[PDB]
Amino acid sequence: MIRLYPEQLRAQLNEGLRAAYLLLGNDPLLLQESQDAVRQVAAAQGFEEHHTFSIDPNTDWNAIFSLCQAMSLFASRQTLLLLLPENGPNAAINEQLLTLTGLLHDDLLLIVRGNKLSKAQENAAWFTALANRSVQVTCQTPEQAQLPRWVAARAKQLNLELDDAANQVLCYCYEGNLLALAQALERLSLLWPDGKLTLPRVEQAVNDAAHFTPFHWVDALLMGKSKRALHILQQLRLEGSEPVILLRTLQRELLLLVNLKRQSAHTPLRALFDKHRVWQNRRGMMGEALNRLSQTQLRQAVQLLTRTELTLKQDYGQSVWAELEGLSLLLCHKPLADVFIDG
Amino acid sequence: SYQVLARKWRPQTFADVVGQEHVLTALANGLSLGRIHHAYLFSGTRGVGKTSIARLLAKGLNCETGITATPCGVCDNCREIEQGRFVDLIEIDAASRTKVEDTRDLLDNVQYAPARGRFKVYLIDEVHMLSRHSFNALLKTLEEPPEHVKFLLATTDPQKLPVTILSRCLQFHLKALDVEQIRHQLEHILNEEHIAHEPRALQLLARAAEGSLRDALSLTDQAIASGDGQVSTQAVSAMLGTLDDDQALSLVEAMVEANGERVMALINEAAARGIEWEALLVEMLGLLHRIAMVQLSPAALGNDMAAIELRMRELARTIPPTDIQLYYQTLLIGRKELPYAPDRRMGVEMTLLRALAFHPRMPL
Amino acid sequence: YQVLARKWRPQTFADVVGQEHVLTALANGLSLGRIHHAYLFSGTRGVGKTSIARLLAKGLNCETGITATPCGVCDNCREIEQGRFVDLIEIDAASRTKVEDTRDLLDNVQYAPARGRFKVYLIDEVHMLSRHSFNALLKTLEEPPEHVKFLLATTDPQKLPVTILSRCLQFHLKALDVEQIRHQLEHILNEEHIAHEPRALQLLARAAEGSLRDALSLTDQAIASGDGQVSTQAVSAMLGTLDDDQALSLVEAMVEANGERVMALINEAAARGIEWEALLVEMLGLLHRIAMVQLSPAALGNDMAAIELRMRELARTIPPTDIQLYYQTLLIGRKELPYAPDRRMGVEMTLLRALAFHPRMPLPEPE
Amino acid sequence: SYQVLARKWRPQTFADVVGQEHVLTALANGLSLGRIHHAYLFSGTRGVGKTSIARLLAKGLNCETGITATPCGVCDNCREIEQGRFVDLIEIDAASRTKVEDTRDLLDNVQYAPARGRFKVYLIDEVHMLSRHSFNALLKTLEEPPEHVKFLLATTDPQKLPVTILSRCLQFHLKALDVEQIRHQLEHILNEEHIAHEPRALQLLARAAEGSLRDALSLTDQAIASGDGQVSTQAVSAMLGTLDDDQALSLVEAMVEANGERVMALINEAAARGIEWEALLVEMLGLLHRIAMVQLSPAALGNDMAAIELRMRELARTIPPTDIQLYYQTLLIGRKELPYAPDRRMGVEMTLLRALAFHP
Amino acid sequence: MRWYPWLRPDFEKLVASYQAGRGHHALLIQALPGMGDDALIYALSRYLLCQQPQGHKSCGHCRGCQLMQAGTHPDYYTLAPEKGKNTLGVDAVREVTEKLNEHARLGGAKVVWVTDAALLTDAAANALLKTLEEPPAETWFFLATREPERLLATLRSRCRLHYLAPPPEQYAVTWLSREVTMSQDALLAALRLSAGSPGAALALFQGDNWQARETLCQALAYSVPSGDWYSLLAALNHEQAPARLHWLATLLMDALKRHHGAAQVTNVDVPGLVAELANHLSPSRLQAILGDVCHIREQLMSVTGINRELLITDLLLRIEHYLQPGVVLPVPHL
DNA sequence: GAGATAGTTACAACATACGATCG
DNA sequence: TTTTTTCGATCGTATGTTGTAACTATCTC
Numbered sequence A: 001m002i003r004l005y006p007e008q009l010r011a012q013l014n015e016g017l018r019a020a021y022l023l024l025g026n027d028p029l030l031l032q033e034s035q036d037a038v039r040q041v042a043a044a045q046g047f048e049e050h051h052t053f054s055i056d057p058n059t060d061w062n063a064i065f066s067l068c069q070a071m072s073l074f075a076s077r078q079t080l081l082l083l084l085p086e087n088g089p090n091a092a093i094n095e096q097l098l099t100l101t102g103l104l105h106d107d108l109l110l111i112v113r114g115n116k117l118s119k120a121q122e123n124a125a126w127f128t129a130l131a132n133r134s135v136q137v138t139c140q141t142p143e144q145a146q147l148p149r150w151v152a153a154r155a156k157q158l159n160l161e162l163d164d165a166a167n168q169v170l171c172y173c174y175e176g177n178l179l180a181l182a183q184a185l186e187r188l189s190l191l192w193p194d195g196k197l198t199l200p201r202v203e204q205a206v207n208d209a210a211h212f213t214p215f216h217w218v219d220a221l222l223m224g225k226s227k228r229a230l231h232i233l234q235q236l237r238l239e240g241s242e243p244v245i246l247l248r249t250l251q252r253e254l255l256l257l258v259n260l261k262r263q264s265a266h267t268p269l270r271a272l273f274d275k276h277r278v279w280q281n282r283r284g285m286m287g288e289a290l291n292r293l294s295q296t297q298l299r300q301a302v303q304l305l306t307r308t309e310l311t312l313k314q315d316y317g318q319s320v321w322a323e324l325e326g327l328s329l330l331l332c333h334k335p336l337a338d339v340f341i342d343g
Numbered sequence B: 001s002y003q004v005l006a007r008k009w010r011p012q013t014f015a016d017v018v019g020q021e022h023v024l025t026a027l028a029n030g031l032s033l034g035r036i037h038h039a040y041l042f043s044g045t046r047g048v049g050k051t052s053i054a055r056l057l058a059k060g061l062n063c064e065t066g067i068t069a070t071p072c073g074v075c076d077n078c079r080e081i082e083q084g085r086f087v088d089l090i091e092i093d094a095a096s097r098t099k100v101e102d103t104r105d106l107l108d109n110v111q112y113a114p115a116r117g118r119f120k121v122y123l124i125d126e127v128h129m130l131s132r133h134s135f136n137a138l139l140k141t142l143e144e145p146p147e148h149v150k151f152l153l154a155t156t157d158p159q160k161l162p163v164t165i166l167s168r169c170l171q172f173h174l175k176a177l178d179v180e181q182i183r184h185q186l187e188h189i190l191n192e193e194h195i196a197h198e199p200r201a202l203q204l205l206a207r208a209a210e211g212s213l214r215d216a217l218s219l220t221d222q223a224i225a226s227g228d229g230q231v232s233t234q235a236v237s238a239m240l241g242t243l244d245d246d247q248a249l250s251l252v253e254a255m256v257e258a259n260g261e262r263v264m265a266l267i268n269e270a271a272a273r274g275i276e277w278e279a280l281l282v283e284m285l286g287l288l289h290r291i292a293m294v295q296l297s298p299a300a301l302g303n304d305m306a307a308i309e310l311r312m313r314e315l316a317r318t319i320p321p322t323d324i325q326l327y328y329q330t331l332l333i334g335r336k337e338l339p340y341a342p343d344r345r346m347g348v349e350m351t352l353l354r355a356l357a358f359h360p361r362m363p364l
Numbered sequence C: 001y002q003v004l005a006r007k008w009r010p011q012t013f014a015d016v017v018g019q020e021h022v023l024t025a026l027a028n029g030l031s032l033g034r035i036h037h038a039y040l041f042s043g044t045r046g047v048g049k050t051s052i053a054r055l056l057a058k059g060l061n062c063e064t065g066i067t068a069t070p071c072g073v074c075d076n077c078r079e080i081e082q083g084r085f086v087d088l089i090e091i092d093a094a095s096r097t098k099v100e101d102t103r104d105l106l107d108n109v110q111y112a113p114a115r116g117r118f119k120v121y122l123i124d125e126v127h128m129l130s131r132h133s134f135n136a137l138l139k140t141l142e143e144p145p146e147h148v149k150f151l152l153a154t155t156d157p158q159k160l161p162v163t164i165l166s167r168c169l170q171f172h173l174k175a176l177d178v179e180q181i182r183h184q185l186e187h188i189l190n191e192e193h194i195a196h197e198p199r200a201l202q203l204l205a206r207a208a209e210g211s212l213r214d215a216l217s218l219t220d221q222a223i224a225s226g227d228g229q230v231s232t233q234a235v236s237a238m239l240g241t242l243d244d245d246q247a248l249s250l251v252e253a254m255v256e257a258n259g260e261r262v263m264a265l266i267n268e269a270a271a272r273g274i275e276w277e278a279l280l281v282e283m284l285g286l287l288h289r290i291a292m293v294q295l296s297p298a299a300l301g302n303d304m305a306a307i308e309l310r311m312r313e314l315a316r317t318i319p320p321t322d323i324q325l326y327y328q329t330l331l332i333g334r335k336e337l338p339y340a341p342d343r344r345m346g347v348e349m350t351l352l353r354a355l356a357f358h359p360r361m362p363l364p365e366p367e
Numbered sequence D: 001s002y003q004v005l006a007r008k009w010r011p012q013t014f015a016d017v018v019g020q021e022h023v024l025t026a027l028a029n030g031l032s033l034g035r036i037h038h039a040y041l042f043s044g045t046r047g048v049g050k051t052s053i054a055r056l057l058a059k060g061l062n063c064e065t066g067i068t069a070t071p072c073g074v075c076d077n078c079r080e081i082e083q084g085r086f087v088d089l090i091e092i093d094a095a096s097r098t099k100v101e102d103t104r105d106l107l108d109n110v111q112y113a114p115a116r117g118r119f120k121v122y123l124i125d126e127v128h129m130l131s132r133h134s135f136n137a138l139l140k141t142l143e144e145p146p147e148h149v150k151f152l153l154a155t156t157d158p159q160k161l162p163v164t165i166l167s168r169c170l171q172f173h174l175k176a177l178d179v180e181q182i183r184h185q186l187e188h189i190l191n192e193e194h195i196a197h198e199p200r201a202l203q204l205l206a207r208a209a210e211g212s213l214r215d216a217l218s219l220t221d222q223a224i225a226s227g228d229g230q231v232s233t234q235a236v237s238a239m240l241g242t243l244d245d246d247q248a249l250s251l252v253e254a255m256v257e258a259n260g261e262r263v264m265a266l267i268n269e270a271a272a273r274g275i276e277w278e279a280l281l282v283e284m285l286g287l288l289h290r291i292a293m294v295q296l297s298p299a300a301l302g303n304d305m306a307a308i309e310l311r312m313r314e315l316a317r318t319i320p321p322t323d324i325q326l327y328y329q330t331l332l333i334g335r336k337e338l339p340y341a342p343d344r345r346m347g348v349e350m351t352l353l354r355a356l357a358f359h360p
Numbered sequence E: 001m002r003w004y005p006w007l008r009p010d011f012e013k014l015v016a017s018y019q020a021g022r023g024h025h026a027l028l029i030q031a032l033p034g035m036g037d038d039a040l041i042y043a044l045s046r047y048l049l050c051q052q053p054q055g056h057k058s059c060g061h062c063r064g065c066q067l068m069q070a071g072t073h074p075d076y077y078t079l080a081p082e083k084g085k086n087t088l089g090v091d092a093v094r095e096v097t098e099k100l101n102e103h104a105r106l107g108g109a110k111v112v113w114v115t116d117a118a119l120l121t122d123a124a125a126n127a128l129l130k131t132l133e134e135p136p137a138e139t140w141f142f143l144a145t146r147e148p149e150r151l152l153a154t155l156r157s158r159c160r161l162h163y164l165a166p167p168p169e170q171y172a173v174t175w176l177s178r179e180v181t182m183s184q185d186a187l188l189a190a191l192r193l194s195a196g197s198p199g200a201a202l203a204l205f206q207g208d209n210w211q212a213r214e215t216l217c218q219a220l221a222y223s224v225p226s227g228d229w230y231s232l233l234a235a236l237n238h239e240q241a242p243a244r245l246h247w248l249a250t251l252l253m254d255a256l257k258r259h260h261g262a263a264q265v266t267n268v269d270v271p272g273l274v275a276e277l278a279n280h281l282s283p284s285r286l287q288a289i290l291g292d293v294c295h296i297r298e299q300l301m302s303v304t305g306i307n308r309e310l311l312i313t314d315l316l317l318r319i320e321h322y323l324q325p326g327v328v329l330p331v332p333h334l
Numbered sequence F: 001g002a003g004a005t006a007g008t009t010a011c012a013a014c015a016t017a018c019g020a021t022c023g
Numbered sequence G: 001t002t003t004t005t006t007c008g009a010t011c012g013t014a015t016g017t018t019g020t021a022a023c024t025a026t027c028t029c
């Protein structure tokens, strides 16, 4: 199976057309672009019929099997599109996909969309059956580090001029949402035919629609950026994330930090990182955390986390977000007079 | 009769729309240059002009003179669209029609050419209420749309739509109308209606609108009814006081400055309407916690409390942290002891008195 | 025979007690001719939301014309009173919460009224509708036909979507005070030819909080208990309220730090068999009232005038710290009451604890 | 086949109930004067006669002779209601019918006229277990029921009901029965059943009842079963684990003297003998209360306790009242947390160890 | 489901009532775990469902006995939590109540057994009240619990209580020595740790719990001198955390009693550990730690879905903080 | 040409999956 | 090169599959 990125998909399609294409990722924009490119190439090759189905427990696989088996009087060269569930395929879906791969024809072009597959999902009969005749395009949203380059390139290909301040504003306002950023660039191009996009011009037609995950919040806490942590927490609250997930994600790192701080008194940090299986890239940030939090801290934080968990579980309270904000400020170097810690 | 202000003053032209320049300018440029997308989506808060702008765009698309951003308003198509009798404009209340069977018949009409219009316009409002099968049918229709049909969507909860639907339409987000624009619109409407008014009443109504023009018009109608055909400062102030439901912040402000009479008056006002005392204590505790967090870092306060941002900022800047902590602890003790008090009101009064005048003695 | 609450429902705007602002606004709107198409009524239970809604419907549909003073004698008024008027569609949202019922109702809104000039939908307990039901009413509510009016009543307005709130005129009814409730009870009893006493009516008004339905229910219960009369003794027995004189005497004895008087009062109460938790609650209330009087001279109400002077004396003598100490001690005693061997034993132990830690005259220290 | 005393001796007439004079008088006056409400609520503790009074009222309403406060008990309606198979008396167990669908189905049938009786009575038991939707659905019809229906509600936790429901009905609160009333009822029942008994056994059972007559009957049945069909002082004392001897006095004296070894030895001996710890704590609390009472006035000491007067007076004179209050508080805290400890003995030992620290 | 000897007397009493027809329709058995109350209830159920009783024991050959042996008797109902769950829901109670209305298949008595009344939810307990008060004819209910005070008062008031007293200490020690081979001190300590109930000590010995207790004792012995109580986490973080917390609380209580001076201690096989605990800690700190341990154990046993590791880590850090001088200690309160 | 039988359409009941609220 | 959640009980919406009743077309006398 070939492995590719969205930029190389067009080159591969020009090279030739394969039997099956797998589009796995979490970025709707890149998935849509890849699907559109593949369908345009197929239509150029002579695929004028397309079908789409949604994979779910209440799915009619008989129709799909009949479509695969049946011929066409004149409208041949069929294209089939599948949309996997957000959670991912299960054993029933695994065997259904294996059966579908068994009934594969040269005139049928298969496309699959869904989230990134894990090792357990990857190690499946249907997945291995397509290994010799498949190409997988990875569509992952770039991080904040690589985002400005992507924004600059996208603006360049649209024949627009972006200032550094405008690029920073666009990255800040639409972080983790590339579809919104592309639509914003299109609207800006519509507003200003001359294509000159300055800071005051962009600031007028931009709204905050960022998307985050709990791992981003934990990373912000580790780095020590109060503003970014608060912004991420507010965005997560607006989205409607479950507080328990955030509590567990913070708990894992907090307990790891407590153990490392306790056992680093008479041991080098590198050996501890090696023993605890810390990823190489993260070892940087963790280090500075151990240079910013004392043993007196990381105990008040644990106490506050336990109190928040108890309040959420037994009391069914609604002030979980306030305690989360307090803990976020506590992890950053702030007084946090402890009247709110109940210590 | 006199009709209703909200219905009577529907924007019938792009010039009548208040604000929303970043959307109107883009739409006008697109219409002038011929760059028209297949699907448009409009998002924003309540009463910001999503439906009005959608109807104006639909009118502009199918005008007799041509595709223009300034509809004539006199040809038969414009009048029919204004009156809601245009054959080629199909308006779908997705909230009322959610089942797939209802949507299928409406979506199957795309196979017929327009009768008396260049485009066949579908205006689906409240589209976030559709079911999964309806969304699938809509996506299938949008995959291969005929060149002579356009789709306009309006909703207040865009996150409810599938990503597949979102990725195939151009989205415009409307903003709040701000106090000044709302006040100017209210003044213009009252001047056109020949209704006496005062600047202070208009300012109060605009401030109470909270970024919604429909709320402002409803409040203006209620004030006119209360004032007996006139808008006056005293009548509007009394009406707003009747609807006022922010006793927690006022109580906090009165307590912080040690004003017992104001505290008693606020307690009486809260008791006048049906309120839960424990809820009031919880709200006061939350406000104190937010003030403490803001004191720790200015970024703690977000856009959710934009209505009372100034008062919270002033309290954070003025009050020392120690007083805030003392009040928070006193209110915690009061909430803890509330169940065993002789009465809920008596418990709240005792706790407020203790916060006002007394200081607990801690061990050691 | 007939229940007082159902019998004495207001039938004209003059019969409504309080709610002056809402009535004035409605009358001005009806007289001027500026009539909206969506009204929302909010307030606590038993304040007259449904009554005012029905009065507004009568005013709209009266045969004489659109007036703020319905005649109350034409066919439409009588039928609305009896609940048999065709054009007044009353919906119990608490029972029909499903979107199918809402769609069925909306499918027949364009038909003209049978006999009246308007078709009025009165939806009660609208806060119990489902989310789909709420979202299905947005467009029809925003732009109803000319001959359609919507009236909504609820006790939990904050559960409605903001979109619904933005489309209607909101009126918030306020709880009634003691004076208005007492006057209404006096009027009702005079019309019913039932003997009564001022103190009984004052007690009933204070025990009804700010709801007239509760006051009428308590009046019916007292009439049943009193065997055709409303007497102060009967009402006091029904409510289980002890004389304020005994509680004030107990508080004064505790303050003076004389155990013999406290024990004598406890024995006297036990002879009658006074409820002990009620005694503790009354003592706590008296202490709280004394503290409030210390805070503000005008805190004391009129109902305590009979003892007012005495109360003032304490407010002039007892330091606030002693009042706080006594209040806290009694609150803790009430908190620990359930686990005591006996209620009498618990109250006696609480009073002994209060006497032992008396700020001025503690019990003698053993040699 | 065999029916326990609680089921057998359910009152069948207004004159057969014990206590609750105010409720009975109010109901009788209302029935006589013709002022009949359409919504009655009964509140109180457990086993005080809420269901019994509700059934008596339902029987009186539908009696063939007429609406009277003294049902005949011999007509067809009275017999059918007593047997619990009367068509027009619908009894709902809200603890198992909490679904709003059941409530809606019940309300949909209120328009039908009663079959035989002049009223259609609905008796909802454990109404506090209904869901919020059920209460809201009830509200409208409960406000203005048809002329041929009545509602009777019985609950033990009226706090959970919404204020809107409480505002629509006449509320009757039932007081907890006194010790003397329970003792008299038990004596009458035993005399009617021809069972030997002693005054002290009845006194102990009434005291252990704690204001609930159902609990008293259950304890009496247990004593009869465990006492070869006879109620005797020794059998009841063994069943309840009465302290009898002055073990509590010695234990409190050891605690006050702050002698840990003696306290632990006494606790070990008590555990070996196998006594009830709750009774021990209650006796210690009573002794502390009596000692505190005596300090205020020497005459407060009871005459029935004229066997340990010297020791009690010594303790009263030697110990300041503040220490007595501290010990009382500690024992109350120990009693509160006893069921939550890993073992009863462990909790008692923890309480005593904590109390031993209050000595300079 | 072993039949212990000390169940011989009590059974002979209860069944006797059922022979005379003077049987209560709701029996609540109070007994510690391992006392064999389940065996007694099973024997009573077998007696009640036998079509041809002889003496105080079932015949064993009638159709009822055969069905009970096969475990497919239509008229026998058991209410227990699901395999993956921990509480008994209201749906099962409602279904059993609705099934009880119809007549018995074999035309005899109907028996319903609740495995543990303490696991009933509030809704299930409230739903069971009406059925328990006035059950249909020839219906018998059996309930078992450890602490009746934890049950609902209304539910409790409808039952007849029967209490099983543990046998004397010497008899239990002799029985345990007969069953298993061990030192006298170990047997006595195991018996005392189980509140004097035999079988629970046998359960401790037959399993690997004794090794876990030894590991915990060694860890505590290491931790007490140095003062690093965090190291105990590995010895406490387990699915059986409540038992180990109970063992730790027992050790602390023994140390405190030894400090005060006493002749009896629960942990008689480890004098050194209790001596070290008494020497190195003050009474106030011991009381505070004991209270915290008991509170955390109660929270773990009560709250559903609580995270074990976080609570244990917080407890250990709190204890370490308390060990520092000049720290205010908790005081019990209502 | 009429009555009886077979076939078709519409409505109701039961089962499964997904989303939301309060304790 | 990964790290993703508390549980029980109750209410509401939409879709798929199976069974029954009423009316029409076709078959037989």
Ligand SMILES: Nc1ncnc2c1ncn2[C@@H]1O[C@H](COP(=O)(O)OP(=O)(O)O)[C@@H](O)[C@H]1O
Pocket: B005, B006, B007, B008, B009, B010, B011, B016, B017, B018, B019, B020, B045, B046, B047, B048, B049, B050, B051, B052, B154, B213, B214
């Ligand atoms: N931008 C605007 N300019 C002028 N009037 C407005 C504007 N937005 C809202 N309104 C007024 O509010 C009323 C309702 O607006 P509506 O079309 O319901 O907006 P939405 O669809 O966002 O709720 C209209 O009658 C209109 O008069």
Ligand SMILES: Nc1ncnc2c1ncn2[C@@H]1O[C@H](COP(=O)(O)OP(=O)(O)O)[C@@H](O)[C@H]1O
Pocket: C004, C005, C006, C007, C008, C009, C010, C015, C016, C017, C018, C019, C044, C045, C046, C047, C048, C049, C050, C051, C212, C213
């Ligand atoms: N303002 C009022 N004036 C006179 N009677 C009132 C008033 N408010 C309530 N009542 C009495 O209370 C009873 C119930 O009122 P109701 O219509 O239920 O009000 P709500 O709808 O707010 O509960 C009525 O029968 C009426 O007699």
Ligand SMILES: Nc1ncnc2c1ncn2[C@@H]1O[C@H](COP(=O)(O)OP(=O)(O)O)[C@@H](O)[C@H]1O
Pocket: D005, D006, D007, D008, D009, D010, D011, D016, D017, D018, D019, D020, D045, D046, D047, D048, D049, D050, D051, D052, D154, D213, D214
């Ligand atoms: N007031 C009373 N007079 C006589 N017996 C009573 C009384 N109250 C309760 N009982 C006894 O207690 C048993 C249960 O009472 P019950 O009707 O369940 O009261 P509740 O509904 O309050 O639990 C009855 O069988 C009856 O014998």
Ligand code: ALF
Pocket: B045, B046, B047, B048, B050, B051, B154, B156, C163
């Ligand atoms: F009609 Al709206 F927000 F209320 F678009």
Ligand code: ALF
Pocket: C044, C045, C046, C047, C049, C050, C153, C155, D164
């Ligand atoms: F009928 Al209501 F509050 F009880 F409106």
Ligand code: ALF
Pocket: D045, D046, D047, D048, D050, D051, D155, D156, E154
């Ligand atoms: F306590 Al009950 F019915 F048993 F009210």
Ligand SMILES: [Mg+2]
Pocket: B050, B051, B052, B125, B154
């Ligand atoms: Mg709109």
Ligand SMILES: [Mg+2]
Pocket: C049, C050, C051, C124
């Ligand atoms: Mg009403």
Ligand SMILES: [Mg+2]
Pocket: D050, D051, D052, D125, D154
């Ligand atoms: Mg009952």
Ligand SMILES: [Zn+2]
Pocket: B063, B064, B065, B071, B072, B073, B074, B075, B076, B077, B078
């Ligand atoms: Zn035109």
Ligand SMILES: [Zn+2]
Pocket: C062, C063, C064, C070, C071, C072, C073, C074, C075, C076, C077
């Ligand atoms: Zn009239």
Ligand SMILES: [Zn+2]
Pocket: D063, D064, D065, D071, D072, D073, D074, D075, D076, D077, D078
């Ligand atoms: Zn009779």
Ligand SMILES: [Zn+2]
Pocket: E050, E051, E052, E053, E058, E059, E060, E061, E062, E063, E064, E065
């Ligand atoms: Zn047999």
